[PDB]
Every structure is written in structure tokens, then in C-alpha cells.
Design an enzyme around this catalytic site. Structure first.
Site, short mmCIF file in Angstrom:
data_model
loop_
_atom_site.label_atom_id
_atom_site.label_comp_id
_atom_site.label_asym_id
_atom_site.label_seq_id
_atom_site.Cartn_x
_atom_site.Cartn_y
_atom_site.Cartn_z
N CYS A 21 4.37 -20.15 -16.61
CA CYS A 21 5.60 -19.39 -16.82
C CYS A 21 6.20 -19.45 -18.21
O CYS A 21 5.86 -20.27 -19.05
CB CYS A 21 6.71 -19.78 -15.72
SG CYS A 21 7.91 -21.08 -16.17
N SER A 95 7.18 -31.66 -16.01
CA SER A 95 6.07 -30.84 -15.61
C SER A 95 6.45 -30.21 -14.24
O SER A 95 6.88 -30.96 -13.35
CB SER A 95 4.82 -31.73 -15.44
OG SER A 95 3.80 -31.03 -14.76
N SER A 96 6.33 -28.90 -14.09
CA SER A 96 6.57 -28.23 -12.81
C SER A 96 5.32 -28.45 -11.96
O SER A 96 4.25 -28.91 -12.49
CB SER A 96 6.81 -26.72 -12.97
OG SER A 96 5.57 -25.98 -13.11
N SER A 235 11.50 -20.25 -10.43
CA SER A 235 10.77 -19.35 -11.38
C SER A 235 10.85 -19.72 -12.84
O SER A 235 10.08 -19.19 -13.62
CB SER A 235 11.19 -17.90 -11.15
OG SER A 235 12.60 -17.77 -11.35
N1 LIG Z 1 6.93 -20.36 -9.08
C1 LIG Z 1 6.60 -19.30 -9.84
N2 LIG Z 1 7.30 -18.99 -10.99
C2 LIG Z 1 7.12 -17.84 -11.68
C3 LIG Z 1 6.16 -16.87 -11.22
C4 LIG Z 1 5.39 -17.19 -9.99
O1 LIG Z 1 4.55 -16.43 -9.51
N3 LIG Z 1 5.65 -18.43 -9.34
N4 LIG Z 1 6.08 -15.61 -11.86
C5 LIG Z 1 6.75 -15.56 -13.20
C6 LIG Z 1 7.02 -14.11 -13.37
S1 LIG Z 1 5.70 -13.05 -13.93
C7 LIG Z 1 8.29 -13.55 -13.20
S2 LIG Z 1 8.53 -11.88 -13.42
C8 LIG Z 1 9.47 -14.46 -12.84
C9 LIG Z 1 10.38 -13.83 -11.81
O2 LIG Z 1 11.55 -14.65 -11.71
P1 LIG Z 1 12.74 -14.14 -10.78
O3 LIG Z 1 13.10 -12.77 -11.10
O4 LIG Z 1 13.73 -15.21 -10.93
O5 LIG Z 1 12.12 -14.22 -9.30
P2 LIG Z 1 11.97 -13.22 -8.07
O6 LIG Z 1 11.71 -14.07 -6.88
O7 LIG Z 1 10.96 -12.17 -8.38
O8 LIG Z 1 13.38 -12.45 -7.88
C10 LIG Z 1 14.59 -13.10 -8.28
C11 LIG Z 1 15.67 -12.84 -7.24
O9 LIG Z 1 16.01 -11.45 -7.16
C12 LIG Z 1 16.76 -11.31 -5.96
N5 LIG Z 1 17.06 -9.91 -5.69
C13 LIG Z 1 16.39 -9.05 -4.86
N6 LIG Z 1 16.91 -7.84 -4.86
C14 LIG Z 1 18.00 -7.94 -5.71
C15 LIG Z 1 18.98 -6.95 -6.08
O10 LIG Z 1 19.04 -5.78 -5.74
N7 LIG Z 1 19.94 -7.49 -6.94
C16 LIG Z 1 19.95 -8.78 -7.41
N8 LIG Z 1 20.94 -9.12 -8.27
N9 LIG Z 1 19.04 -9.70 -7.07
C17 LIG Z 1 18.11 -9.21 -6.22
C18 LIG Z 1 15.88 -12.02 -4.94
O11 LIG Z 1 16.64 -12.40 -3.81
C19 LIG Z 1 15.32 -13.20 -5.79
O12 LIG Z 1 15.90 -14.46 -5.50
O13 LIG Z 1 9.04 -15.71 -12.37
C20 LIG Z 1 8.10 -16.35 -13.26
N10 LIG Z 1 7.83 -17.68 -12.84
S1 F3S Z 2 5.22 -26.66 -16.41
FE1 F3S Z 2 4.58 -24.47 -16.60
S2 F3S Z 2 5.09 -23.16 -14.90
FE2 F3S Z 2 6.88 -23.03 -16.21
S3 F3S Z 2 8.42 -24.66 -15.83
FE3 F3S Z 2 6.95 -25.54 -17.29
S4 F3S Z 2 5.94 -23.63 -18.18
#
Ligand SMILES: Nc1nc2c(c(=O)[nH]1)N[C@H]1C(S)=C(S)[C@@H](COP(=O)(O)OP(=O)(O)OC[C@H]3O[C@@H](n4cnc5c(=O)[nH]c(N)nc54)[C@H](O)[C@@H]3O)O[C@H]1N2
Ligand code: F3S
Ligand SMILES: Nc1nc2c(c(=O)[nH]1)N[C@H]1C(S)=C(S)[C@@H](COP(=O)(O)OP(=O)(O)OC[C@H]3O[C@@H](n4cnc5c(=O)[nH]c(N)nc54)[C@H](O)[C@@H]3O)O[C@H]1N2
Ligand code: FES
Ligand SMILES: [Ca+2]
Ligand SMILES: [Ca+2]
Ligand SMILES: [Hg+2]
Ligand SMILES: [Hg+2]
Ligand SMILES: [Hg+2]
Ligand SMILES: [Mo+4]
Ligand SMILES: [O]
EC number: 1.20.9.1
Lengths: 822, 133
Positions: A21, A95-96, A235
Site C-alpha cells: 500500500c 509492519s502491517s 487500508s
Molecule cells: N488491507 C488492504 N489495504 C489496501 C488495499 C487492499 O486491498 N487491502 N488496497 C489499497 C488500494 S488500491 C486502495 S484504492 C485503498 C482503498 O482505501 P479505502 O478507500 O480506505 O477503502 P475501501 O474499503 O475501498 O472504502 C473506504 C470506505 O468507503 C466507504 N463508503 C462506501 N460508500 C461510500 C459513500 O457513498 N460515501 C462515503 N463517504 N464512504 C463510502 C466504505 O464503507 C469503506 O469503509 O486501500 C489500499 N490499501
Molecule cells: S507494511 Fe505495507 S501494506 Fe501499507 S501499511 Fe506499511 S506499506
């Protein structure tokens, strides 16, 4: 097992940024001969830790999953240990669970990476077989040349990563970008996460505010942090843990008071704008107490109404920075008129009580007693980026932020939290039209489609319509190849091309693994990830670092920028031999032997004398960065833009953007924009009117993206054998489903499946399903709706749920206990 | 030898354990805190007459903070970075930052004496190079 092999005191150590991430946590990779090991005394192992007696809590992050034994091309075996860097300012040793698995996800012939592509793979009409690189190139370049010659670039399609970290980065985005845009010159290109060549941030950028405009240190200095459409604990884990939580805990107050001696700093507070109560809200309440957290649990898709209401209110209260508005912005009065919405109407639309809207505004914008406006950092991610009309929501949010001077002041910023890391250097997109690539493929366009570093079978919106069409068009090409016997490459190129004139599509995938794309692909090329190659990328505060190569890629796998060069050179030679000099010249510029050559040619040439047009996150001072200089900088790297470089100071960068009010616009002022509230798009409203449940979707803290590595990990598969769907307990009881049952989720767009996960925090009529997974793809039920720039409302869909039955083995082995800490 | 030499440590007799009432003990040495609990309903790998007695190391496998047993959820919770482990699923991490499940203390149940004895550990205890120092 029940023991670990310690790295010897003199073990080789290299730097590695997390592959995953946006946070970009810094790690070290220790590598040493298999049959050697360090001693338990602190000075006898490379960790410098005393293993002669129990270590105290927080002293280390070390488990067997953070270790592996790799086998090099020369057959020599080496222990590796990939652990976080305590001195890296980003993560301070954290570390995550995702980055902690890096050692396990490195390639080994017997481990989790056993199935890494290590040779070109060809679906030879009716079976998968290995093939040579020269043949793969003659076939691939052959089809591209024939299509360019007869149809022009419009017949060559790509869906490619545009991101940083593994499967991205400055070397790789330049290589692929130069190939698609400068050499092939095709406009039929989409991006890994959106179906057209566009930006997630058109509105903020046009308003003059680049989306990564602050430092993670600003989260430590803020009075209030907003997390909008974002679940940061899951995330952007270590940014939340190492920077946000210390602020809530009061550990950064003295820093604030030291920087601003005459300013009041109340205990920090946090506001979440998310329809769903997430593990991030739960942790914020645990740490700061309920009274210091506001969860604005808005109705799905109502963000614009929320921000228009808040903007109207602060303007009415005078809780704005009038001198800043008058000196550094344009469009304020018009925005006040176009975005007017009362708090009562705001509350009616969003479902948020008027008192809570007023409290959010008071904590965030009302002047502190010492006179200054609170420093309010507004962080947002996919809940609004993939929300109800990306362009309009951002317009509304940035108006509020600009009016309250929450960009450019330390402790503030209106920033994307990020997904992958960033690492973009590319020529300009060769077109003037916005093209919805998936729709063009579904309609039958294109001769060849290449998925590069992405897997839209699991991640496209309206994914079922995409897979239906691609499988059918792929089958036409297979059936045509089945009729051949003893065909040379040239004759096969014609056989395939003719099939594409009959509805077919030749499909290529460049990836680390076969993936579900293998169900349709005719050709797959093996790529290499960070550690098997050098790679540069920056994190959510623009901090660029170099991840160093330390091992060989599996078989003949290759860096993506070098695969792009191989393709370009194959096409150049074909045009030269066909006597087409002008066409051959388009493919010059790929005489690269290593990824560093792609760094020198793209990132380091941006804005330099004699260089072509280059769009780079490094800007025109990128040439000051070199691999050697980054290496000397360690995992701390430098925050872009680089300001200077010299031997005595090293690279010197920029902590925060817009601190002088000079915005990225024609006149240097930030521009307010209108934000009409239109309700849900008709396409989504129709599903909502027909079906019962809001099908929210997104991330799980333990699963990384499409689970390309996780699918092979025994612990991940034991814990999440299937994609899960969080459901309200009263809804579950009514439908007679409980943890471990399997349900069908469906609507007019598609049908998919998930294992039920009862969650008390979920609202009635709402659900949340893990996206992009390998067993139960969520996207089959997302709609085809996109905003004006073709940004999908992935978070906007409704559907019904049907019980399939009880999966006895999931009940026996999977925990369905609460993932919200409380 | 390829195996570590684990001690055989008496915990208590099974009939003395109360349902869902954790017993603290150290194993395989005094620097390694553990908890045994008779869960009340059978779980795979539980021992005793009701196949429901399990035990674990309580040091979080992420960075070693001692976890606490939550009787209402039958989980172990880490206060440092919020990981939580399931005592009814062999220490399965429910949510969190660790990359290993909570180490299981292997118990022998002897019907002739009613004794519960810790005799091994499945998984590597936080903060040590081997389970036995
Ligand atoms: N653990 C982990 N981490 C990641 C990733 C992964 O696959 N796993 N992917 C990475 C990537 S590519 C990305 S893009 C990021 C995404 O990071 P985030 O955007 O933080 O994660 P999401 O779960 O996609 O959605 C965030 C929140 O949007 C809310 N939501 C849904 N609909 C709406 C709405 O209409 N309005 C509002 N305000 N909120 C709404 C949901 O309830 C959700 O909690 O995470 C990154 N980090
Ligand atoms: S360990 Fe990797 S997955 Fe994101 S929170 Fe740190 S860059
Ligand atoms: N419903 C719904 N859909 C979504 C989202 C959502 O919130 N809801 N999120 C959207 C978002 S934010 C994103 S980022 C997309 C993600 O959509 P994708 O980009 O399709 O998913 P990833 O898993 O990131 O894909 C990376 C692929 O590249 C391969 N790979 C890994 N490293 C390398 C490398 O070094 N080289 C090469 N060539 N290949 C490599 C992996 O094996 C994997 O197949 O999904 C989008 N789709
Ligand atoms: S030490 Fe337990 S969650 Fe980090
Ligand atoms: Ca389907
Ligand atoms: Ca709980
Ligand atoms: Hg944006
Ligand atoms: Hg239920
Ligand atoms: Hg959690
Ligand atoms: Mo993303
Ligand atoms: O993303």
C-alpha cells in the site's frame, strides 16, 4: 517451525519499500548463505537484538513468515529475512500484516510463490504450453504490426497499471507508457482501476490542488482529522498507527506547542464520513473516547449534500478565512450561491442529525480562543473517489477546504489517503476523447487486448458483462487456431487476425501469476517484482525511495519496463525488415539493458533540454535523483519535489505544498467550483428501487487486492476461504443465514456469491462485501455507471440476497467474530 | 536431535477449571506467560472430557504486547495495534497486524489422574529465537 535462523552479524542488508500500500513503510532485507546463521548475543546477529533471554514487548517484529530460503539462478540457496526499519520516519519500525508477509511472497520453487509465471505461456488452440520468448514476441508483435498496418492504433487495446510499488513504479510506468503512447500510439488504453485513461482527481487538480499536498507529519500536527470514504486502519495501516493515533493519544501536543507558541491546541478529535461503522471508527473511539469522535454515518452517495451543507453553514457563521479567500482564490461568491443548502435539508438528505453537523463544523472550523482557525486535515479515499459522481463530490469538498484555508497550513491538507504507492512518469495520452474501454470491448472492438499488471476479471465495474464478452471473443480465436496444422508464426498471425474479423479478440496478460485471466488469455508473459529488480516509487506524502534488487526473478521473468523494451524492439526490427522506416522510427528509444535505463530515460529526463513531452510526478528536478543518491538517503528517501542536491546535504525536498498560496492553476489561485446535488444516478437508483440491499464493498485489512499472492497462502485461505459479506443481524435472522452460510448476491447487472458474516455494526438494509477476491467476485453486481470523466460509482449498487446453504467446513474452521476492536 | 526439549509442566487438574474462567501459568519458562481455559463447548483440538480445554501463549505475535482474554467473545485482544485472536479456532487471527496465529500450548489430559500438563507449543512465541531458550 518453533525456531528462526538469525542473520549473521555480517549478513548482506539492502533497503526495500513495502511492495504494497501507499504508506510505503521502509524495510530491510537480510540475505545470507543457507547454511550460516547469527548468534543469539546482540553483537553476533545483524538485528543487534539479545536473544539470550526473552525480548521485551515492541522490541522487534519477527515471525517465521518474515523469513524464507531462496534459490538463485546459479543454484545457491540463501536465507532471507524481510523486517521493518526502525529508523524509517514513515513507519518507525511498524509492519502491517500485508508487508510482514513479504519474505513469504518472494519467489521460491516450493513456497507460496511456486506458481509464479517463469516462462512465456501460450494457449496453443486447445491447451496451455510453454513457448520461447522469441516466439511470444514474433506472435505478439506480429499481431500488433498487422493491426497497425490494417486498422491503425485503434485496433490495439491495453488495460495497464499506472501506479507505484510492486507492479508499478517510475521505471515501469515509463516503459509501458513510452510503448503504448509514443511507439504504438494507441488511445485505446484504460488503467488498472478505472475503465478509461482519466484521473481519480480531475476536480481537485483543476481547482489547483494536487491530491498529495502534505506530509504524514501534518497528521501529527492537526487539531482535527477528517477521514472521508476511508477505512485507514485497514487500508493505510501504518500512517494511521504511526501518525494519527499518536496525535489522538496526546503524544504530539508538545510538538504543536513548540511550533506555535501562541496558539491553543485542544485534545485532537476525529470525524469519519462513512455510511458504515468500521474497525477505524471503533479504534478511534477506543483511543480517543466517544466524545472525541464523530461518525457521520451518511446515507450512501450523499457526500455532496453533506459538504454543501457544511460549506453553507461555515459561510453563514463566518467561520472562513476571508483574507485568504480574497488574496488566493477565485469563484467563492458563485460557489456560495450554487452550493447553498440548509442544515435542515442537509440533515434530511444525509440522515445526519443537525446537532452533529453543527458539532463537526464547530470542532473543525470555528476559531480557537487564541484566534487561529483549527488545523483540520481532510483525508479522503475510495468511498468518495468511487462515490456518487466523483467530480461533483470533490468540487463540494474542496470548496469547504479552500474557504477554511485547510490547505497549505501545517496540520492541514485535503489529501487522498492513497491506494498503491505512486510512481508515474509517462508521455501524454495520445488522444482527445474519453473512451470507456470495457464498453468498447463488450461491443466487439479491437483485435488484441493486453492486461498488464492488472486483472479486470476480478476488478472491473460491471465485471460480469466484461467476463461474458471476453470469454466468448477469446473462444472464437481458440476455435480458429484449432483448425491449423504446422503453421509458422506468420501464418498463425493471419489465422488469429482473421478470427478477430469474426468477433474474436486475441488476449495477452503480463503478470506474476496465471490468475483468472488464464481462463481467456492466449498468451501470458512473466514479470518480476521489487527485490527481483530495482524499483522506485513514492508514498502518500511524495517520499520517493529505491527498493534494491537482492535476488533473481523466477526462470525468465523480467521487469515490466524491459518487457515493454522487448516488445518495442521486436516491432522495430519487424518494421525495419518490412522496409517501413517511418514506422520503425516510432519504436526507437528502447535500447535498455536494466530498469535503471528506464529511470534515466523517463523520470530523469522530464523537462530537460531536448526531451519530449513527459508527465512526471518527479517534475523537472527529477534529474537530481539517481539510484546512488536514493540509496544513500536510506528508507527515508526524499519528499518530492526535490529542491536541490549536493554532496554535503544530499537530496533536499519539500514537506508541504501550497504553503504560500501559489496554486496549480492559470492565475495561481485556488478555484471554487459548483457542486449540484442530483441524488443517486438513475442507473443506480433503478437497482435501489428494485432490490433490497445496499452492496457496499471494499477492503479487508488482511487481504491484499485481488489476492494474487494470498490465494496461495495457507493461513489466508484458512481464514478467508471465500469473499465474505457483512450483514446486519436482524437482516440475517430474517433470511435465516448465519456465519458460514453461502448466499447468492444479485441484481440486474450480475450474480455472485459470498459467505455470510453477521456484523452487529452493519445497518439494516446495508451490507459490505470484500471486493476483487478469488472466490466470489464482488464486481459482478456493480453497475456500468460512471461520472463525466468515466470514473465508476463502484460503491453505488443494490441487490437481493438468496441463501444457498450452510458450508459446514467454513463453520468448522473460519472465525465469524467481530473485526471491530471493542 | 531435531526437536527442542520442552518441559512437561503441570497446569492443574481438569475438574478444577471453571467454564470460561482463565488460568494463568508460564510455559516453557517464567518469561513466557500463557493462559488455559475450559471453553464450555467442544472445539477441534480441545482436551479434557468435553474436548474444550485449550491453552495459548498470550504474547501478541505482532510485537509482543501481552494480550488479554475477553470472556464475552472467547478471544485474546492486543491493546497495542488492535489484533484479536480466536480462542475457539486455535488462535486464528480475526483481524490484526500479526502474520501468525496465537501460539497454541499443547496440553496432555491424563484420565487416570485428571491432570492437565503443558508439553509443547505449536507456533513460535514472540521475542525469542526458539521456543526453548
Ligand atoms: N488491507 C488492504 N489495504 C489496501 C488495499 C487492499 O486491498 N487491502 N488496497 C489499497 C488500494 S488500491 C486502495 S484504492 C485503498 C482503498 O482505501 P479505502 O478507500 O480506505 O477503502 P475501501 O474499503 O475501498 O472504502 C473506504 C470506505 O468507503 C466507504 N463508503 C462506501 N460508500 C461510500 C459513500 O457513498 N460515501 C462515503 N463517504 N464512504 C463510502 C466504505 O464503507 C469503506 O469503509 O486501500 C489500499 N490499501
Ligand atoms: S507494511 Fe505495507 S501494506 Fe501499507 S501499511 Fe506499511 S506499506
Ligand atoms: N467493486 C469494486 N471494484 C474495485 C474497487 C472497489 O473498491 N470496489 N477498487 C478499484 C481499485 S481502487 C483498484 S486499485 C482496482 C484493482 O484492480 P487490479 O489492478 O485489477 O487488481 P490488483 O490486484 O492490484 O492487480 C495487480 C495484478 O498484477 C499482478 N502483478 C503483481 N505485481 C506485478 C508486477 O510486478 N508486474 C506485473 N506485470 N504484474 C504484477 C498481480 O498478480 C495481479 O494480477 O480494483 C478496482 N475495482
Ligand atoms: S503488538 Fe499486538 S497488535 Fe501489534
Ligand atoms: Ca457472475
Ligand atoms: Ca468485542
Ligand atoms: Hg481526488
Ligand atoms: Hg443471522
Ligand atoms: Hg480490527
Ligand atoms: Mo486502488
Ligand atoms: O487505487
Amino acid at each position: 517451525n518453533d525456531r528462526i535462523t538469525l542473520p549473521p552479524a555480517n549478513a548482506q542488508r539492502t533497503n526495500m519499500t513495502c511492495h504494497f500500500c501507499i504508506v510505503g513503510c521502509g524495510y530491510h532485507v537480510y540475505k545470507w548463505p543457507e547454511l550460516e546463521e547469527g548468534g543469539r548475543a546482540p553483537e553476533q546477529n545483524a538485528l543487534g537484538l539479545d536473544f539470550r533471554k526473552q525480548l521485551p514487548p515492541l522490541a522487534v517484529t519477527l515471525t517465521p513468515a518474515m523469513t524464507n530460503v531462496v534459490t538463485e539462478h546459479d543454484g545457491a540457496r540463501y536465507d532471507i529475512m524481510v523486517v521493518p526499519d526502525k529508523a524509517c520516519v514513515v513507519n518507525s519500525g511498524l509492519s502491517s500484516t500485508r508487508g510482514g508477509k513479504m519474505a513469504s511472497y518472494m519467489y521460491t520453487p516450493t513456497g507460496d510463490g511456486k506458481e509464479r509465471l517463469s516462462a512465456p505461456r501460450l494457449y496453443a488452440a486447445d491447451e496451455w504450453v510453454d513457448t520461447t520468448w522469441d516466439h511470444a514476441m514474433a506472435l505478439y508483435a506480429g499481431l500488433i504490426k498487422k493491426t497497425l498496418d490494417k486498422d491503425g492504433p485503434q485496433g490495439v487495446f491495453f488495460s495497464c497499471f499506472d501506479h507505484g510499488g510492486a507492479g508499478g513504479g517510475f521505471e515501469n510506468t515509463w516503459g509501458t507508457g513510452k510503448l503504448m503512447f509514443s511507439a504504438i500510439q494507441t488511445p485505446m488504453v484504460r488503467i488498472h482501476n478505472r475503465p478509461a485513461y482519466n484521473s481519480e482527481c480531475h476536480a481537485t487538480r483543476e481547482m489547483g490542488i494536487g491530491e498529495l499536498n502534505n506530509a504524514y507529519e501534518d497528521a501529527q500536527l492537526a487539531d482535527v482529522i477528517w477521514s472521508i470514504g476511508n477505512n485507514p486502519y485497514e487500508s493505510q495501516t501504518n500512517y494511521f498507527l504511526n501518525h494519527w493515533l499518536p496525535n489522538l493519544q496526546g503524544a504530539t501536543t508538545s510538538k504543536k506547542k513548540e511550533r506555535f507558541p501562541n496558539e491553543n491546541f485542544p485534545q485532537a478529535r476525529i470525524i469519519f464520513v462513512d455510511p458504515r461503522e468500521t474497525p477505524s471508527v471503533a479504534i478511534a473511539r477506543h483511543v480517543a473516547g466517544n466524545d472525541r469522535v464523530l461518525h457521520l454515518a451518511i446515507e450512501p452517495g450523499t457526500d455532496t449534500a453533506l459538504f454543501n451543507g457544511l460549506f453553507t453553514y461555515v459561510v453563514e457563521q463566518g467561520w472562513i478565512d476571508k483574507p485568504f479567500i480574497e488574496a488566493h482564490t477565485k469563484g467563492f461568491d458563485d460557489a456560495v450561491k450554487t452550493n447553498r443548502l440548509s442544515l435542515d435539508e442537509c440533515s434530511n438528505i444525509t440522515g445526519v442529525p443537525v446537532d452533529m453537523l453543527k458539532r463537526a463544523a464547530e470542532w473543525s472550523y470555528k476559531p480557537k480562543a487564541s484566534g487561529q482557525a483549527p488545523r483540520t486535515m481532510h483525508a479522503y479515499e475510495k468511498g468518495i473517489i468511487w462515490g456518487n459522481d466523483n467530480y461533483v463530490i470533490q468540487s463540494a469538498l474542496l470548496d469547504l477546504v479552500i474557504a477554511t484555508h485547510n490547505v497549505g497550513r501545517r496540520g492541514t491538507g485535503c489529501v487522498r489517503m492513497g491506494g498503491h504507492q505512486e510512481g508515474y512518469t509517462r508521455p501524454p495520452y495520445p488522444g482527445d476523447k474519453k473512451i470507456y474501454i470495457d464498453q468498447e470491448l463488450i461491443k466487439g472492438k479491437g483485435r488484441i487486448m493486453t492486461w498488464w499488471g492488472c486483472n479486470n476479471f476480478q476488478t472491473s465495474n460491471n465485471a460480469q458483462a466484461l467476463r461474458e464478452a471476453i470469454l466468448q471473443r477469446s473462444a472464437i480465436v481458440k476455435q480458429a487456431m484449432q483448425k491449423a496444422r504446422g503453421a509458422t508464426t506468420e501464418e498463425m498471425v493471419d489465422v488469429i487476425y482473421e478470427a478477430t474479423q469474426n468477433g474474436g479478440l486475441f488476449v495477452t496478460s503480463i503478470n506474476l501469476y496465471p490468475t483468472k485471466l488464464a481462463e481467456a488469455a492466449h498468451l501470458m508473459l512473466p514479470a518480476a517484482h521489487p527485490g527481483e529488480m530495482n524499483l522506485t516509487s513514492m508514498n502518500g506524502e511524495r517520499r520517493i525511495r529505491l527498493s534494491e534488487k537482492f535476488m533473481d526473478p523466477p526462470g525468465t521473468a523480467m521487469a515490466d519496463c524491459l518487457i515493454a523494451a522487448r516488445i518495442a524492439n521486436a516491432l522495430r526490427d519487424m518494421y525495419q525488415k518490412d522496409g517501413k522506416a517511418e514506422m520503425a522510427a516510432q519504436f526507437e528509444g528502447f535500447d535498455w539493458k536494466t530498469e535503471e535505463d528506464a529511470f534515466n530515460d523517463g523520470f530523469r529526463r522530464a523537462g530537460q533540454p531536448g526531451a519530449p513531452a513527459i508527465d512526471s510526478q518527479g517534475g523537472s528536478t527529477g534529474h537530481l535523483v539517481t539510484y546512488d543518491r536514493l540509496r544513500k538517503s536510506g528508507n527515508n528517501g526524499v519528499q518530492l519535489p526535490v529542491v536541490s542536491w549536493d554532496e554535503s546535504k544530499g537530496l533536499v525536498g519539500t514537506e508541504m505544498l501550497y504553503t504560500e498560496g501559489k496554486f496549480d492553476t492559470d492565475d495561481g489561485k485556488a478555484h471554487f467550483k459548483p457542486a449540484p446535488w442530483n441524488g443517486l444516478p438513475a442507473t443506480v437508483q433503478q437497482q435501489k428501487d428494485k432490490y433490497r440491499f445496499w452492496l457496499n464493498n471494499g477492503r479487508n485489512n488482511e487481504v491484499w487486492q485481488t489476492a494474487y499472492h494470498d490465494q496461495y497462502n495457507s493461513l489466508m485461505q484458512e481464514r478467508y476461504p471465500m469473499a465474505y459479506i457483512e450483514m446486519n443481524p436482524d437482516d440475517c435472522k430474517q433470511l435465516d443465514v448465519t456465519g458460514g452460510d453461502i448466499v447468492e448476491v444479485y441484481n440486474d447487472f450480475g450474480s455472485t456469491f459470498a459467505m455470510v458474516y453477521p456484523v452487529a455494526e452493519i445497518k439494516r438494509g446495508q451490507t459490505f462485501m470484500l471486493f476483487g477476491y478469488v472466490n466470489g467476485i464482488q464486481g459482478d453486481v456493480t453497475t456500468d455507471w460512471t461520472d463525466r470523466d468515466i470514473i465508476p460509482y463502484y460503491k453505488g449498487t443494490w441487490g437481493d440476497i438468496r441463501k444457498v446453504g450452510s458450508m459446514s467446513e467454513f463453520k468448522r474452521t473460519v472465525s465469524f467474530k467481530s473485526r471491530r476492536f471493542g | 536431535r531435531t526437536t527442542l526439549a520442552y518441559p512437561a509442566t503441570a497446569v492443574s487438574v481438569a475438574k478444577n477449571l471453571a467454564a470460561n474462567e482463565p488460568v494463568s501459568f508460564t510455559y516453557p519458562d517464567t518469561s513466557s506467560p500463557c493462559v488455559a481455559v475450559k471453553l464450555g463447548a467442544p472445539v477441534p483440538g480441545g482436551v479434557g472430557p468435553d474436548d474444550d480445554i485449550v491453552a495459548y501463549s498470550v504474547l501478541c505475535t505482532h510485537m509482543g504486547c501481552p494480550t488479554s482474554y475477553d470472556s464475552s467473545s472467547k478471544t485474546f485482544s492486543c491493546p497495542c495495534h488492535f489484533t484479536e485472536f480466536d480462542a475457539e479456532k486455535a488462535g486464528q487471527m480475526i483481524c490484526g497486524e500479526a502474520t501468525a496465529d496465537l501460539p497454541r500450548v499443547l496440553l496432555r489430559y491424563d484420565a487416570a489422574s485428571d491432570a492437565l500438563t503443558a508439553v509443547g507449543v505449536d507456533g513460535l512465541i514472540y521475542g525469542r529465537q526458539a521456543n526453548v531458550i
